[PDB]
Amino acid sequence: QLTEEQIAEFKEAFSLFDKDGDGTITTKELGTVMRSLGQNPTEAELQDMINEVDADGNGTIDFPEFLTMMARKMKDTDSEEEIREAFRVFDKDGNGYISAAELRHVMTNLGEKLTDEEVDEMIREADIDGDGQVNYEEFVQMMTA
């Protein structure tokens, strides 16, 4: 269990983003920090980063949500974030879904060239395929569960 010193350190790290003191991180604060880091983002990207981690749905990052995401960020690398990145590599359109034809092309041509039967089994086992549009939910559920 965390001690008082560890909670203080994490609260200080939170204060690096929670400048106003509201007890929550808004989109503007994250944008200011990121632009101070020379990574000028868009409103869409800032909203996407604020989401995907705010479990309470308030639209702003809390302290427990910050602790939950720091549980992953303190590691040298994370699996879920990198699987999402690999998914977004081939989701150039941005629709959030991968067509069966594009996925088959990628798996048969780009990487280690899976056999056609293996690709057929994979695309069939993709439950979030929705009759063709494989979503990011299937990719996460394949490895996480």
Partner: protein
């Protein structure tokens, strides 16, 4: 939640403690090796019991050090399992982790084993090209590689760093995808405190290299030249600086190798130090602004003086040419020369002002 993060923190603390103990035992072994090497040449022989006691103490330290390294790598693998969501430790072994663990054990396992083993050593003397045969103890070949144990210092430096273990730093570096490894910490130190890092590295290299030079050279040196500690320090300093060798040339290939390594290190360390000094002799931006302001003020004053002299000489040339019944040519020539000098001064000061206005932006 509040358990996984505390578990990672506890694992990191255990790793840090194991690193501290490994460094302590490695440095203890190196120090006892240095003491025994110094004392067996003089006070006691290699068949003495003081030699046996000190070498058995070295071997015990080495056993404890190997155990500490193995337990440290076990804690590494356990933390790897915790991080990369793994349940089998065999996922960690990747033909590179195994190789580096084996290299670390091999490096930390070399030490002068107890016993009295000797070998024949033949070297060609410097500047005279005469042979020298001595019966040397094997322990020197096993003592010198013990200085390779100083990577544990780098390990401790990484593990005690604030950047490596701090929620604020990791949270900020996750936004830029910064890789927090030993290279990053070393580069950060070379950016913050370059002179101090280079000074510490150079002094430690100087003492270590001079001692190992004399330890190798004392076998074939019966004239107190390169086996002298102070002479070895001078030799290391002048090969580091690439001035050369004086009459101080190693009789052994161990000494030549140490001198070559010192020269290679110096060729880069000297240039880095000079870059640091050149940067530290440069004015700050605010100091640059102040200096440019004051120089421009002085330049304006000097321009005004030069123009005044130009006008004065232009007047006096006319006043001594006309306006006088008897024209004194010597004085008129003097004032014409002064007029030309004033013109040249005005031109030069105006071009200085132009240059300063160019560097002012």
């Amino acid at each position: 939640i509040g358990y996984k993060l505390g578990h990672r923190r506890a694992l990191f603390e255990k790793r840090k403690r194991l690193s501290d103990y490994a460094l302590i035992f490695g440095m203890f072994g190196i120090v006892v090796m240095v003491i025994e090497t110094e004392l067996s040449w003089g006070a006691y022989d290699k068949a003495s019991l003081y030699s046996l006691a000190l070498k058995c103490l070295i071997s015990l330290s080495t056993i404890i050090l190997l155990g500490l390294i193995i337990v440290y790598h076990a804690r590494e693998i356990q933390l790897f399992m915790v991080d990369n969501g793994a349940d089998d430790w065999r996922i960690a072994m990747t033909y590179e982790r195994i190789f580096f663990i084996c290299l670390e054990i091999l490096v930390c396992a070399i030490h002068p084993i107890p016993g009295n083993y000797t070998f024949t050593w033949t070297a060609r003397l410097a500047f005279s090209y005469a042979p020298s045969t001595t019966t040397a103890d094997v322990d020197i070949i096993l003592s010198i590689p013990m200085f390779l144990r100083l990577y544990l210092i780098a390990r401790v430096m990484l593990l005690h760093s604030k950047l490596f273990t701090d929620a604020s730093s990791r949270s900020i570096g996750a936004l830029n995808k910064i890789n927090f490894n030993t290279r990053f910490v070393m580069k950060t130190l070379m950016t913050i405190c370059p002179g101090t890092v280079l000074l510490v590295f150079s002094i430690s290299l100087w003492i270590i290299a001079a001692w190992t030079v004399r330890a190798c050279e004392r076998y074939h040196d019966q004239q107190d030249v390169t086996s002298n500690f102070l002479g070895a320090m001078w030799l290391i300093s002048i090969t580091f600086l690439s001035i050369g060798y004086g009459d101080m040339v190693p009789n052994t290939y161990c000494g030549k190798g140490v001198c070559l390594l010192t020269g290679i290190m110096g060729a880069g360390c000297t240039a880095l130090v000079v870059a640091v000094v050149a940067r530290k002799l440069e004015l700050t931006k605010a100091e640059k602004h102040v200096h440019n302001f004051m120089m421009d003020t002085q330049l304006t004053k000097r321009v005004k003086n030069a123009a005044a002299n130009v006008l004065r000489e232009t007047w006096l040339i006319y006043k001594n040419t006309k306006l006088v019944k008897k024209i004194d040519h010597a004085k008129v020539r003097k004032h014409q020369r002064k007029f030309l000098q004033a013109i040249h001064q005005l031109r030069s000061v105006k071009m200085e002002q132009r240059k300063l206005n160019d560097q002012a932006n």
